[PDB]
Design a protein around this ligand. Structure first.
Ligand SMILES: *C(=N)[C@H](C[C@@H]1CCNC1=O)NC(=O)[C@@H]1[C@@H]2[C@H](CN1C(=O)[C@@H](NC(=O)C(F)(F)F)C(C)(C)C)C2(C)C
Ligand SMILES: *C(=N)[C@H](C[C@@H]1CCNC1=O)NC(=O)[C@@H]1[C@@H]2[C@H](CN1C(=O)[C@@H](NC(=O)C(F)(F)F)C(C)(C)C)C2(C)C
Lengths: 306, 306
């Protein structure tokens, strides 16, 4: 029993982190086989970053201008190219620690683990969700760019995020591993608008199932509701609509606990309308929306990775 | 910016996990050089665990009765001994992935990362604190025993916890790596009393400093207090006494923010007496006590590990 915010084991990703330096700018890169992936603004000076022309800046670089260090071993760069907002540096050595891997683009509401790194070295690991406004609530300092987000499936690391930038409100933005930003953002140091965020309903429901599995059952009421009626009530509270796809994904938790999804929705509706009346669920005084249904199953059923 | 519950990178520990089976009981072991460390109740049947005589049970085992698997490679056992509540299995192969390491016994209030494992394979990583009553609030299922807790210092893994047991309230107990329990517990399936828990004051103060560093400053009041006056008020709220040692450990955060420790204590006193009036600090509606002063510094200053 017990329920914690849990990250994936980070070792497979640790074996892929390197330091990339161009001029006096240093950040992290991801070394897979004979390619290093990193944010393209490694080629910028501080002044360039206010309004960069990355294509022009890259024209004036050659391979040897990129200092790639894996520990205290320099990796010789033998080619380079830009793909959207990421640079790809071909090196003459394949990473022997390369795991089985995929590049994926995740959906708003899905979670991932972040291995926060500085100078090519890991600092720590934490769990994040892609918010509905395509930001993440991370923890990142100067030099963290190129840190990656990922999920694991048995032996396969699915990389989904590379870190690029922070909005002065402490929220974070980045790209998939093809260099395409999540959200309407660009890698330039200028003010940019983000959509208002919303609560990830299907995840709140998953966490209420986690609560029941752990014996925290006080909020279960005797009612049911329709999907339509639930979505009208939840819209007022800035919850995202719950779809039939979401109901279907909640099926395994519903079957395990014997609580119908629409019955759990009726309990959530009461919590939204009435509050929690000074009580906690799984130790929290607020409803938590950064556990997916799979997160709950993998933690409560002890799924392992190879 | 941003502040998350952050675990240490787990890769160095992942390389040490193995599966140990004796009879039909299987749990996790920790393989360092040519020794595997695991909970001694691997030698128990389910019935033995109600009232085990471990010395008698071990008498009747020989080396070959222990099946140790590192991946799909069986490690030949060539000696065994019991040290308090842990078994030590000598194997004929040294773990080539053994990190620099130490065995330490941590103090109540200190935190560590847990790599939760099943069948010798990692499931996930999360951060825990040793509670003042010597329990931890973990997330552990059947088969998790032998999972370890640890801290890292540059390249050195300090192992501080091995998991043994769950009290039916969802809290957890275990040993240091010399097999000595934290707290007044024994590895037998019978009801046992734990002390009432208390709030780790020095950690709450560390987290309030983390909040200020992140721009969450609403709770700062204009007052100071004495250490004596703070401790009288906090005792009522089941907070542990704040010592001069604690004040000294908070020095780096105090100097960084320019807020005297006793001034932060005056702000905490107001929060304890008045509540948070529907507001949050770092997104939490409750005061958080499972970040140490070092946790705050290592996250907010980007300390890395080798
Ligand atoms: C990569 N190493 C850093 C990570 C930042 C630094 C502080 N916390 C983080 O997550 N990325 C940057 O410094 C990027 C980079 C130029 C400026 N930048 C920012 O993150 C800035 N934010 C923005 O410009 C905004 F608001 F639009 F997101 C900064 C004000 C420095 C936090 C480029 C090329 C975008
Ligand atoms: C190790 N693999 C498990 C981990 C447990 C299992 C469920 N969650 C956990 O953390 N350890 C055990 O099963 C130990 C073991 C016998 C019984 N046990 C318990 O954890 C039991 N708890 C107690 O006996 C109590 F309450 F005293 F802590 C159980 C009721 C099965 C949760 C031995 C040898 C103590």
């Amino acid at each position: 029993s017990g329920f914690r915010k849990m990250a994936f084991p980070s070792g497979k990703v640790e074996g892929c982190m390197v330091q990339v330096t161009c001029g006096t700018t240093t950040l992290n890169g991801l070394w897979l086989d004979d390619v290093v992936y990193c944010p393209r603004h490694v080629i910028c000076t501080s002044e360039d970053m206010l309004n960069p022309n990355y294509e022009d800046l890259l024209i004036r670089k050659s391979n040897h201008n990129f200092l790639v260090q894996a520990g205290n071993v320099q990796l010789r760069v033998i080619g380079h190219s830009m793909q959207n907002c990421v640079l790809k540096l071909k090196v003459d050595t394949a990473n022997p620690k390369t795991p089985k891997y995929k590049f994926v683009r995740i959906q708003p509401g899905q979670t991932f683990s972040v291995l926060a790194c500085y100078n090519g070295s890991p600092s720590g690991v934490y769990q994040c969700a892609m918010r509905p406004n395509f930001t993440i609530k991370g923890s990142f300092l100067n030099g963290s760019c190129g840190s990656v987000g990922f999920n694991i499936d048995y032996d396969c690391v699915s990389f989904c995020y590379m870190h690029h930038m922070e909005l002065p409100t402490g929220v974070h933005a980045g790209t998939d591993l093809e260099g395409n930003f999540y959200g309407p953002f660009v890698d330039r140091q200028t003010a940019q608008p983000a959509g208002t965020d919303t609560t990830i309903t299907v995840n709140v429901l998953a966490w209420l199932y986690a609560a029941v599995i752990n014996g925290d059952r006080w909020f279960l009421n005797r009612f049911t509701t329709t999907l339509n009626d639930f979505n009208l009530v939840a819209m007022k509270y800035n919850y995202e609509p719950l779809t039939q796809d979401h109901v279907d994904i909640l099926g395994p938790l519903s079957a395990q606990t014997g609580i119908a999804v629409l019955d759990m929705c009726a309990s959530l509706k009461e919590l939204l309308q009435n509050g929690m009346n000074g009580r906690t669920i799984l130790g929290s005084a607020l409803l938590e929306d950064e556990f997916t249904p799979f997160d709950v199953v993998r933690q409560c059923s002890g799924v392992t990775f190879q």
